[PDB]
Design a protein around this ligand. Structure first.
Ligand SMILES: COC(=O)[C@@H]1C[C@@H](O)CN1C(=O)c1ccco1
Length: 291
């Protein structure tokens, strides 16, 4: 899977909101392009002159994420965040020249991402009361990953002493994206746990935070809620479910070639952090079948 890299695997089965610190700083922003940000402005002008209904929006930028020594007391993760935008994403990560920008960043800054917008995405491994994970089929008509399989998620928009409000918006945003796309009531969802962070190498290394969320509804009840919105209530074209038993070997299935990179990140981190038991009971051969 060359199109996905793990940047962070969380300890303890995943981190709750109260264990994460954020540092939101203009030191964590993208660097101006070598020949100037006029190249971004030109791409955006060309795009608006074909699709004038498009609009810009602010986004969080991932700079880096440092985990505490394992088993320690106190805050367990520091997220270093900057600010970026949809416009800056279209002019950098989505540019035909994105690989040239990665090489230039290595040369000038010793940082392949220095000249990239790198907006932070969120995604969920969303589990049902009857032990399935939730999958969504992407429209064949959109620009990114057309016709591929995804999990619930999105790219949160801004609004430890401004830090804690930023962590709150990240955790809030993954629940809001489940409510908006899957049409589930907020009170059927658990507080999220952060499983880790994955990078999409097909989008020049932009990162997504991947979360575990439990729903109190069965797969049949989740399907009813999704469908009862009608075609205008969701961006996806269909919903489906895979038993958690079978997610263990998903990379060996024909479904794997249909998953978009950020969804592959969610399922790798689910298998490493929530799956993969460490104790004698769940590690026994009748509960953890060999192969
Ligand atoms: C990195 O992902 C994105 O920027 C996606 C891509 C496209 O679907 C639009 N988009 C937004 O998030 C967006 C546009 C305006 C407000 O939000």
């Amino acid at each position: 899977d060359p199109e996905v890299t793990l940047l962070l695997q969380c300890p303890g089965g995943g981190l709750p909101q109260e264990q994460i610190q954020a540092e939101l700083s203009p030191a964590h922003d993208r660097r101006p392009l070598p020949g100037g940000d006029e190249a971004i402005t030109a791409i955006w002008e060309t795009r608006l002159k074909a699709q004038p209904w498009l609009f810009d929006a602010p986004k969080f930028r991932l700079h880096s994420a440092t985990l505490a020594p394992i088993g320690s007391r106190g805050p367990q993760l520091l997220l270093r965040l900057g600010l970026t935008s949809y416009r800056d994403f279209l002019g950098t990560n989505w540019s035909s020249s994105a690989a040239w920008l990665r090489q230039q960043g290595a040369t000038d800054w010793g940082d392949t991402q220095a000249y990239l917008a790198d907006p932070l995405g969120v995604g969920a491994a969303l589990a049902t009361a009857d032990d399935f994970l939730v999958f969504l089929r992407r429209s064949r008509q959109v620009a990114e990953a057309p016709g591929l399989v995804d999990v619930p998620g999105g790219h949160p928009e801004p609004q430890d002493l401004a830090g804690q409000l930023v962590v709150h918006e990240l955790f809030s945003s993954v629940l809001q994206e489940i409510c908006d796309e899957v049409n589930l009531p907020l009170l059927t969802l658990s507080q999220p746990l952060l499983l880790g962070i994955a990078r999409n190498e097909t989008s020049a290394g932009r990162a997504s935070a991947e979360f575990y969320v439990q729903c109190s509804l069965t797969s049949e009840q989740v399907r009813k809620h999704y469908l009862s919105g009608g075609p205008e209530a969701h961006e996806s074209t269909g919903i489906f479910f895979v038993e958690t038993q079978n997610v263990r070997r998903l990379p060996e299935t024909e479904m794997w070639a249909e998953l978009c990179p950020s969804a592959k990140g969610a399922i790798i981190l689910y298998n490493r952090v929530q799956g993969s038991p460490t104790g004698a009971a769940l590690g026994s051969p009748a509960l953890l079948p060999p192969l």
